[PDB]
Amino acid sequence: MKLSEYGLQLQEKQKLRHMYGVNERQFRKTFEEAGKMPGKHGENFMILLESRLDNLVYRLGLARTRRQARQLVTHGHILVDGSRVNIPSYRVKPGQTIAVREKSRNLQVIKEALEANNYIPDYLSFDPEKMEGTYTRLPERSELPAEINEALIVEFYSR
């Protein structure tokens, strides 16, 4: 009942869930769905989250914030590998790219986020000319939030 480490664990899970705003259904599911690769389930969880269609959009600088990258997806405006994906929970993987939709290119919210280029990761190749964000490699932890953890969340399911 008094302060204890058991709480700090479920805590790291909350703040993280509020980080990119991953719904619980996406948080728990994405987890058991990451237990597939033998690369430490923890890391795998921090990897799938990045695949978040919205994150990628807000990362390549196609939107100023999640409220901008979220509406862009749902409003069907991103062509993954050349395919519209109005699904925010879907997930992308190397061998495909994110390409804004033609009728959705002069969007001020985008033409406005292109300038807000807050540095683009090294595994993401962005071509402003065609507005194509290619996933050329997987994301490492060196870039993903460092003030975040996942072990305390690993055993959480063991409870």
Swiss-Prot record:
Q: Which GO terms describe its cellular component?
A: small ribosomal subunit
Q: Which UniProt keywords apply?
A: Antibiotic resistance, Ribonucleoprotein, Ribosomal protein, RNA-binding, rRNA-binding
Boundaries of each S4 RNA-binding domain copy?
51-111
GO MF terms listed in the record are: rRNA binding; structural constituent of ribosome
Q: List GO BP terms, alphabetically.
A: response to antibiotic; ribosomal small subunit biogenesis; translation
This protein's source sits in the domain of life called Bacteria
Role summary: One of the primary rRNA binding proteins, it binds directly to 16S rRNA where it nucleates assembly of the body of the 30S subunit. With S5 and S12 plays an important role in translational accuracy.
What the record says about family reads: Belongs to the universal ribosomal protein uS4 family.
Oligomeric state and interaction partners are given as: Part of the 30S ribosomal subunit. Contacts protein S5. The interaction surface between S4 and S5 is involved in control of translational fidelity.
Return the protein name: Small ribosomal subunit protein uS4
Native organism? Geobacillus stearothermophilus (Bacillus stearothermophilus)
Name the gene for this chain. Answer: rpsD
